[PDB]
């Protein structure tokens, strides 16, 4: 039906495939950050997952914030004590773009445990907008996932929630996931979820849509499969806790497959 | 930009989060519209964030062009290409002549082009009314004011329920549907089509219920046959009066067969069956479309 925009779906997908390349963070930026590391970024993104839970924000909003952070850090050196300020302004901007009811700015100051003042948050908001040139309408993993979901025969809630969970795990680890485009992470996440739950594979209809096959997705899939296997042991655990919730069909309690047989 | 290179000419409008001026670039000669957005304690308004970010991507002859953003501590200026007036003022100025059919047809065709471009780029406009449709002296009409617009996903999620100025608001918004989509903008353009022909609003309600009943009295009260699922919608009531559907030639009497066909497809109750902007471009109504200059001085 119209909710799936049959007349525009293909144009939109093509448009998003163009925009994701344009909106891609620089793969090697952390190497050029003197004071911050992949690990500090992981702590930040895991904290943002908690914030999104506390304020019941869309998963889309979390994805956007991470894109804004990674793009900002692709050009701006940031000291460790200011990383959370960048993160907080990014989540504020993402909320204003994406939410019906974004949290008030005071709410954002509050969740930083008063590390920063309202004035700092608002000044950082301005700075992020300048650096990103107001280019906030970025493609996310989720925007591709929800399109890929329309190819299930039939739709399966565990498959959907699990794919989301997996895409969300990739946000935490810049190594290796900065290497991969949202459409590619979404494709590996969808195949891996479909396989875990139903034993099915990346469907032909999606090869037709995306031009991706199991062979082009192999590198990301191998990375994502390992991430899925190691998830109970990762230092950051907020996504796993989040995805125990009935809201997401408790999918983080499902067991990863031991092999992919790819 | 900028700012020091702009010479303000006159105030031309207003303005929730600010004011619009006609101005000119002193160095290039270019005439522009400057939309001033007042800053602060929630920082940059979400409406300004959406308007700017969404318009950055939307380069099309029938979408008002955002030229620059002048971004400072206490002020934000959006610099737009200048357009001479809005469709509403054009309709008022055409009071006694009416609008020639070739112009109405040209304007609808351009609006559909501009809208299809929005929808192909996952943007809902969500406030198409004659006041937001700007015209120039060369015969162009363009979509303006994206403060209320939204980047959507496929399939759509639930977005703001407020949506669309009442007179142009689609029945699926009025009936509280969990989801609405691109069809809401087509509904608005169908209302605008009728309005260009009559120079009066098709459905001028004063409340949501009044709006609904005015629609039902023109198009018939929808049932399960015309609109599957209608009776299960949140704000549908079994007590709704059941009005018969009018002969459609009576809705907009001076409209020809092709015009009535297209209008009827834009005003279809069922959002799933309502015509898309992309499909509408190929409607027989446009077989002889041209792009004439407006007949009146702007
Ligand atoms: N009078 C008035 N009120 C509100 C908005 C505008 C307006 C506008 C607007 O609200 C957004 C974008 N462009 C606009 N614009 C252009 N390009 N030319 C002339 C006027 C104008 N004009
Ligand atoms: Mg480093």
XYZ file of C-alpha atoms and ligand atoms in Angstrom:
583
model
C 0.000 0.000 0.000
C 0.875 3.757 0.025
C 2.681 3.362 3.308
C 5.283 1.396 1.380
C 5.325 4.141 -1.339
C 5.246 1.715 -4.350
C 5.647 4.604 -6.817
C 8.788 6.008 -5.117
C 10.501 3.131 -3.283
C 13.029 2.466 -6.082
C 13.829 6.190 -6.579
C 14.296 6.563 -2.813
C 16.587 3.550 -2.528
C 18.708 4.872 -5.446
C 18.798 8.305 -3.788
C 19.863 6.849 -0.410
C 22.607 4.796 -2.135
C 23.967 8.049 -3.577
C 23.647 9.973 -0.301
C 25.313 7.304 1.895
C 28.606 7.658 -0.039
C 28.345 11.463 0.304
C 27.555 11.211 4.062
C 30.170 8.559 4.854
C 32.590 9.399 7.722
C 36.326 9.122 6.983
C 37.362 5.514 7.575
C 40.731 6.406 9.135
C 39.788 9.360 11.352
C 40.551 7.845 14.786
C 44.225 7.447 13.777
C 44.263 11.249 13.305
C 42.608 12.022 16.663
C 45.465 12.668 19.158
C 43.326 12.373 22.302
C 40.465 9.952 21.596
C 40.290 6.252 20.712
C 37.854 3.688 19.275
C 37.297 2.555 22.862
C 36.270 6.013 24.089
C 33.911 6.260 21.094
C 32.416 2.879 22.072
C 31.701 4.183 25.606
C 30.055 7.257 24.052
C 27.847 5.321 21.609
C 26.850 2.851 24.358
C 25.902 5.853 26.569
C 23.801 7.272 23.684
C 21.954 3.912 23.500
C 21.099 4.394 27.233
C 19.947 7.982 26.609
C 17.697 6.754 23.743
C 16.210 4.182 26.151
C 15.736 6.648 29.020
C 13.908 9.111 26.762
C 12.267 6.454 24.579
C 13.812 7.880 21.381
C 13.491 6.254 17.952
C 16.304 3.902 16.963
C 16.564 6.126 13.843
C 17.551 9.074 16.078
C 20.441 7.040 17.616
C 21.706 6.086 14.130
C 21.591 9.740 13.000
C 23.477 10.960 16.095
C 26.268 8.447 15.498
C 26.537 9.552 11.841
C 26.754 13.200 12.981
C 29.428 12.355 15.575
C 31.573 10.348 13.154
C 31.342 13.043 10.445
C 32.158 15.797 12.994
C 35.171 13.785 14.245
C 36.309 13.249 10.649
C 37.324 16.950 10.571
C 37.489 18.258 14.163
C 40.040 17.177 16.791
C 38.315 16.791 20.133
C 39.778 16.369 23.647
C 38.479 13.422 25.710
C 36.688 15.706 28.202
C 34.743 17.290 25.312
C 33.784 14.072 23.481
C 30.552 13.700 25.496
C 29.645 17.337 24.658
C 29.903 16.532 20.907
C 27.825 13.373 21.561
C 25.147 15.268 23.486
C 24.773 18.045 20.851
C 24.591 15.347 18.151
C 21.745 13.563 19.986
C 19.959 16.920 20.446
C 20.243 17.660 16.739
C 19.131 14.147 15.779
C 16.136 14.415 18.136
C 15.029 17.743 16.673
C 15.308 16.301 13.139
C 13.698 12.927 13.776
C 11.449 13.052 16.892
C 7.823 14.162 17.183
C 8.608 15.168 20.766
C 12.344 15.765 21.226
C 13.577 16.073 24.840
C 14.071 19.669 26.027
C 17.657 20.993 26.070
C 17.596 20.932 29.899
C 16.924 17.195 29.656
C 20.145 16.839 27.596
C 22.157 18.892 30.153
C 20.713 16.707 32.940
C 21.861 13.383 31.387
C 25.472 14.625 31.108
C 25.428 14.620 34.973
C 25.971 18.425 34.727
C 29.441 18.004 33.159
C 28.358 20.730 30.783
C 26.197 23.806 31.027
C 23.196 24.579 28.818
C 25.293 27.292 27.155
C 27.981 24.776 26.138
C 25.423 22.316 24.734
C 23.800 25.087 22.674
C 27.148 26.426 21.447
C 28.190 22.881 20.486
C 24.849 22.476 18.648
C 25.730 25.546 16.537
C 29.267 24.285 15.909
C 28.051 20.813 14.811
C 25.562 22.464 12.402
C 28.387 24.582 10.934
C 30.815 21.669 10.516
C 28.092 19.484 8.944
C 26.714 22.442 6.953
C 23.167 21.566 8.138
C 23.420 18.309 6.139
C 21.416 16.268 8.647
C 19.226 14.090 6.405
C 21.719 11.216 6.267
C 20.941 7.596 5.346
C 21.170 5.119 8.205
C 21.348 1.322 8.508
C 17.709 1.446 9.606
C 16.486 3.233 6.491
C 17.855 0.378 4.335
C 16.750 -2.381 6.796
C 13.094 -1.356 6.723
C 13.131 -1.508 2.922
C 14.870 -4.931 2.976
C 12.170 -6.168 5.424
C 9.537 -5.787 2.709
C 11.181 -8.736 0.929
C 10.424 -11.298 3.679
C 8.162 -14.227 2.772
C 6.379 -13.784 5.145
C 7.346 -11.009 7.599
C 8.907 -12.257 10.822
C 9.236 -10.021 13.912
C 12.209 -11.896 15.332
C 13.982 -11.502 11.952
C 13.229 -7.743 11.966
C 14.194 -7.092 15.595
C 17.343 -9.223 15.344
C 18.523 -7.418 12.176
C 18.061 -4.122 14.013
C 19.962 -5.396 17.047
C 22.870 -6.437 14.812
C 22.949 -3.097 12.947
C 22.910 -1.367 16.304
C 25.905 -3.416 17.548
C 27.950 -2.168 14.567
C 27.510 1.470 15.724
C 29.696 0.683 18.808
C 32.855 -0.472 17.040
C 34.420 2.002 14.574
C 36.950 -0.731 13.856
C 35.864 -2.359 11.634
C 32.431 -0.859 10.884
C 33.564 2.589 9.682
C 34.805 0.615 6.633
C 31.267 -0.370 5.593
C 28.348 1.654 4.162
C 24.938 1.602 5.920
C 23.351 -0.338 3.030
C 26.014 -3.030 3.313
C 25.802 -3.355 7.113
C 21.982 -3.534 6.776
C 22.316 -6.234 4.132
C 24.676 -8.345 6.290
C 22.470 -7.719 9.334
C 19.350 -8.802 7.424
C 20.951 -11.990 6.015
C 22.434 -12.932 9.396
C 19.106 -12.381 11.195
C 17.160 -14.323 8.535
C 19.667 -17.178 8.765
C 19.739 -17.248 12.590
C 15.934 -17.309 12.916
C 14.626 -19.158 9.821
C 17.640 -20.771 8.152
C 16.965 -18.738 4.965
C 19.462 -16.582 2.985
C 19.706 -13.131 1.392
C 16.883 -13.443 -1.173
C 17.208 -13.121 -4.983
C 14.675 -10.272 -4.923
C 17.157 -8.248 -2.824
C 20.039 -9.136 -5.155
C 17.793 -7.556 -7.806
C 17.142 -4.449 -5.679
C 20.629 -3.821 -4.317
C 23.054 -5.587 -6.670
C 24.583 -7.128 -3.516
C 25.190 -10.900 -3.311
C 26.471 -13.106 -0.481
C 29.938 -12.784 -2.039
C 29.980 -8.958 -2.005
C 28.572 -9.034 1.576
C 31.059 -11.706 2.805
C 33.653 -9.346 4.456
C 31.010 -7.432 6.462
C 29.127 -10.667 7.302
C 32.322 -12.277 8.659
C 32.887 -9.180 10.806
C 29.243 -9.043 11.937
C 29.071 -12.757 12.697
C 32.112 -12.406 15.001
C 30.569 -9.346 16.633
C 27.364 -11.333 17.204
C 29.343 -14.280 18.691
C 31.406 -12.039 20.991
C 28.536 -9.753 22.052
C 28.044 -11.248 25.570
C 31.729 -10.478 26.293
C 31.997 -6.947 24.850
C 32.795 -4.220 27.409
C 29.704 -2.330 26.237
C 26.395 -4.072 27.008
C 23.576 -1.473 26.684
C 22.286 -2.712 23.304
C 22.084 -6.322 24.579
C 20.124 -5.149 27.663
C 17.918 -2.970 25.428
C 17.164 -5.892 23.103
C 16.070 -8.250 25.942
C 12.952 -6.106 26.022
C 9.623 -7.444 24.702
C 9.476 -4.298 22.585
C 12.184 -5.969 20.457
C 10.941 -9.552 20.964
C 13.809 -10.393 23.356
C 16.038 -11.071 20.356
C 19.332 -10.600 22.223
C 18.526 -13.901 24.025
C 18.629 -15.830 20.730
C 21.818 -17.830 20.144
C 24.072 -16.846 17.235
C 24.747 -19.554 14.651
C 28.095 -21.273 15.145
C 28.858 -21.201 11.388
C 27.529 -19.313 8.347
C 28.319 -21.947 5.796
C 29.035 -19.206 3.270
C 27.835 34.524 2.432
C 27.341 37.158 3.524
C 24.963 39.849 4.931
C 27.123 42.880 4.149
C 26.515 42.214 0.426
C 22.721 42.288 0.845
C 20.622 45.440 0.542
C 17.178 44.946 2.137
C 14.393 46.355 -0.046
C 11.159 45.746 1.885
C 9.494 43.366 4.321
C 7.438 40.859 2.311
C 6.122 38.456 4.982
C 5.937 36.714 8.363
C 6.560 34.402 10.042
C 6.432 31.968 12.990
C 10.118 31.930 13.928
C 10.644 35.161 12.011
C 10.383 37.563 9.078
C 10.883 37.534 5.273
C 12.517 40.409 3.382
C 13.020 41.135 -0.273
C 16.708 41.995 -0.682
C 19.334 42.355 -3.392
C 22.900 41.146 -3.765
C 24.820 44.430 -4.221
C 27.618 42.745 -6.193
C 25.771 40.303 -8.526
C 22.427 42.139 -8.736
C 20.561 38.998 -7.681
C 17.203 39.608 -6.020
C 16.583 37.283 -3.066
C 14.195 36.520 -0.256
C 15.823 36.579 3.180
C 14.075 34.495 5.799
C 15.303 35.583 9.219
C 15.106 32.994 11.989
C 15.374 34.427 15.520
C 17.701 32.417 17.776
C 17.018 31.359 21.423
C 16.508 28.930 24.953
C 16.034 25.733 22.955
C 18.734 26.638 20.427
C 18.074 26.249 16.693
C 14.346 25.531 16.079
C 13.659 22.011 14.768
C 11.532 23.618 12.035
C 14.581 25.576 10.794
C 16.789 22.473 11.074
C 14.357 20.503 8.874
C 13.746 23.321 6.378
C 17.445 23.877 5.774
C 18.616 20.238 5.760
C 15.730 19.138 3.582
C 16.107 21.986 1.072
C 19.911 21.366 0.717
C 19.058 18.190 -1.201
C 16.033 19.476 -3.146
C 17.309 21.160 -6.277
C 14.452 21.332 -8.747
C 12.874 24.058 -10.980
C 9.578 23.770 -9.038
C 11.045 23.909 -5.535
C 12.176 27.291 -4.164
C 15.987 27.286 -4.167
C 17.867 27.756 -0.930
C 20.928 29.779 -2.048
C 22.804 30.207 1.213
C 22.568 30.030 4.986
C 24.058 32.934 6.972
C 24.726 31.416 10.316
C 25.753 33.451 13.361
C 25.330 33.596 17.168
C 21.950 35.346 17.465
C 20.636 35.236 13.887
C 20.042 32.731 11.118
C 19.271 33.961 7.586
C 18.033 31.656 4.861
C 18.712 33.160 1.440
C 16.199 32.009 -1.183
C 15.709 32.872 -4.849
C 13.108 35.685 -5.056
C 9.616 34.910 -6.311
C 7.127 37.704 -6.971
C 3.998 36.444 -5.311
C 2.035 33.564 -3.863
C -0.786 31.710 -5.589
C -3.368 32.953 -3.075
C -2.671 36.619 -3.955
C -2.659 35.666 -7.644
C -6.113 34.056 -7.280
C -7.434 37.186 -5.497
C -5.962 39.414 -8.236
C -7.647 37.142 -10.854
C -11.062 37.607 -9.153
C -13.011 38.897 -12.171
C -11.115 37.334 -15.077
C -10.578 33.976 -13.427
C -7.325 32.143 -14.196
C -6.997 31.049 -17.842
C -7.133 27.276 -18.169
C -3.654 27.026 -19.821
C -2.190 28.727 -16.730
C -4.101 26.519 -14.228
C -2.974 23.469 -16.219
C 0.633 24.708 -16.373
C 0.689 25.402 -12.623
C -0.794 22.033 -11.647
C 1.728 20.255 -13.930
C 4.630 22.140 -12.330
C 3.325 21.486 -8.798
C 3.097 17.760 -9.545
C 6.659 17.810 -10.922
C 7.936 19.586 -7.781
C 6.012 17.244 -5.501
C 7.061 14.026 -7.269
C 10.651 15.219 -6.872
C 10.053 15.660 -3.114
C 8.514 12.230 -2.781
C 11.311 10.581 -4.866
C 13.700 12.120 -2.309
C 11.707 10.842 0.690
C 10.342 14.290 1.706
C 6.711 14.965 2.672
C 5.823 18.634 2.375
C 2.765 18.499 4.692
C 1.598 22.110 4.236
C 0.656 22.599 0.560
C -1.787 25.531 0.487
C -1.858 28.398 -2.031
C 0.135 30.644 0.349
C 3.151 28.299 0.143
C 3.117 28.119 -3.669
C 5.134 30.961 -5.162
C 5.012 32.318 -8.711
C 7.378 34.357 -10.859
C 6.931 36.542 -13.941
C 8.242 33.844 -16.303
C 5.405 31.346 -15.570
C 7.072 29.159 -12.957
C 5.276 28.023 -9.786
C 7.289 26.586 -6.872
C 6.873 24.763 -3.565
C 7.953 26.869 -0.643
C 8.144 26.781 3.156
C 9.522 23.347 4.173
C 9.384 24.219 7.910
C 6.626 21.624 8.294
C 8.213 18.997 6.057
C 9.593 15.575 7.089
C 12.173 13.117 5.750
C 10.347 9.797 5.686
C 11.376 6.158 5.719
C 10.063 3.257 3.676
C 7.637 2.024 4.897
C 6.547 5.136 6.830
C 6.477 5.315 10.671
C 4.052 7.406 12.735
C 4.885 11.116 12.438
C 3.291 14.236 13.862
C -0.492 14.164 13.896
C -1.001 17.918 13.757
C -0.400 18.117 10.071
C -1.459 20.271 7.204
C -3.516 23.454 7.313
C -7.094 22.281 8.011
C -8.684 23.179 4.673
C -6.080 21.088 2.752
C -5.868 18.238 5.266
C -6.447 14.673 4.045
C -9.239 12.473 5.478
C -6.747 9.880 6.763
C -5.169 12.593 9.007
C -8.621 13.754 10.153
C -9.619 10.147 10.902
C -6.487 9.582 13.040
C -4.784 6.858 10.966
C -1.584 5.554 12.607
C 0.232 6.107 9.336
C 0.022 8.647 6.585
C 2.180 8.953 3.491
C 2.779 10.740 0.182
C -1.010 10.634 -0.505
C -1.514 13.466 2.025
C 0.298 15.922 -0.287
C -1.719 14.813 -3.337
C -4.938 15.433 -1.391
C -3.732 19.002 -0.737
C -2.874 19.524 -4.430
C -6.363 18.227 -5.433
C -7.883 20.923 -3.150
C -5.549 23.487 -4.799
C -6.566 22.308 -8.327
C -10.266 22.872 -7.520
C -9.386 26.229 -5.911
C -7.482 27.532 -8.971
C -10.618 26.776 -11.064
C -13.188 28.317 -8.627
C -10.910 30.763 -6.759
C -12.546 29.566 -3.520
C -11.440 26.849 -1.067
C -12.968 23.461 -1.800
C -13.413 22.415 1.848
C -13.321 25.472 4.140
C -14.092 23.846 7.536
C -13.634 25.548 10.925
C -12.939 22.409 12.944
C -11.841 18.849 12.279
C -15.387 17.516 12.403
C -16.736 20.384 10.285
C -13.883 19.703 7.782
C -14.740 15.975 7.644
C -18.488 16.631 7.143
C -17.808 19.135 4.360
C -15.684 16.495 2.637
C -18.355 13.797 3.181
C -21.056 16.094 1.717
C -19.046 16.546 -1.477
C -17.490 13.118 -1.918
C -20.005 10.938 -0.033
C -19.499 9.501 3.435
C -16.945 6.708 2.858
C -17.816 3.079 3.678
C -15.938 -0.268 3.523
C -16.599 -0.509 -0.226
C -15.051 2.838 -1.164
C -12.366 2.722 1.524
C -11.493 -0.652 3.107
C -10.754 -0.195 6.771
C -12.389 3.211 7.129
C -14.792 2.061 9.849
C -11.977 0.799 12.039
C -10.088 4.100 12.011
C -9.564 5.713 15.461
C -11.742 8.778 14.882
C -14.338 7.160 12.673
C -17.771 7.103 14.360
C -20.693 4.849 13.342
C -22.953 7.901 14.036
C -21.403 9.887 11.105
C -24.194 11.034 8.773
C -24.158 8.993 5.550
C -24.173 11.525 2.726
C -24.574 10.447 -0.879
C -21.754 11.100 -3.315
C -22.363 14.044 -5.612
C -22.233 13.808 -9.344
C -18.621 14.930 -9.722
C -19.382 17.443 -12.495
C -21.253 19.360 -9.806
C -18.166 19.692 -7.566
C -16.270 21.868 -10.039
C -18.861 22.705 -12.770
C -16.586 24.502 -15.277
C -14.125 21.553 -15.366
C -13.860 19.421 -18.540
C -13.921 15.588 -18.594
C -10.138 15.179 -18.325
C -9.923 17.744 -15.481
C -12.658 15.946 -13.527
C -11.001 12.604 -14.035
C -7.673 13.854 -12.606
C -9.370 15.737 -9.751
C -11.365 12.616 -8.824
C -8.137 10.582 -8.682
C -6.381 13.146 -6.482
C -9.394 13.192 -4.100
C -9.812 9.428 -3.821
C -10.653 8.521 -0.210
C -8.421 5.486 -0.019
C -4.768 6.684 0.255
C -3.728 3.382 -1.440
C -5.794 4.240 -4.553
C -5.231 8.002 -4.656
C -3.083 8.961 -7.707
C 0.665 9.628 -7.156
C 2.310 12.858 -8.392
C 4.487 10.765 -10.724
C 1.467 8.981 -12.327
C -0.559 12.226 -12.528
C 2.033 13.815 -14.865
C 0.932 11.365 -17.589
C -2.788 12.208 -17.168
C -4.639 13.074 -20.436
C -5.507 16.459 -18.807
C -1.917 17.524 -19.548
C -1.800 16.391 -23.236
C -1.729 20.025 -24.392
C 0.115 21.665 -21.441
C 2.291 24.713 -22.136
C 4.057 27.119 -19.744
C 2.676 30.600 -20.371
C 3.631 33.760 -18.496
C 0.970 34.930 -15.980
C -1.688 37.099 -17.599
C -1.376 39.796 -14.922
C 1.386 41.994 -13.661
C 2.960 40.660 -10.490
N 5.226 36.865 2.222
C 5.871 35.728 2.607
N 5.542 35.130 3.781
C 6.164 34.008 4.174
C 7.152 33.458 3.365
C 7.476 34.076 2.164
C 8.520 33.488 1.280
C 9.257 32.220 1.523
C 9.329 31.144 2.546
O 8.563 31.128 3.676
C 10.229 30.118 2.308
C 11.009 30.126 1.142
N 10.976 31.087 0.193
C 10.131 32.145 0.330
N 9.980 33.170 -0.530
C 10.608 33.406 -1.700
N 11.546 32.559 -2.183
N 10.292 34.518 -2.411
C 9.367 35.384 -1.963
C 8.710 35.140 -0.759
C 9.042 34.003 -0.034
N 6.829 35.201 1.802
Mg 43.386 8.330 18.446
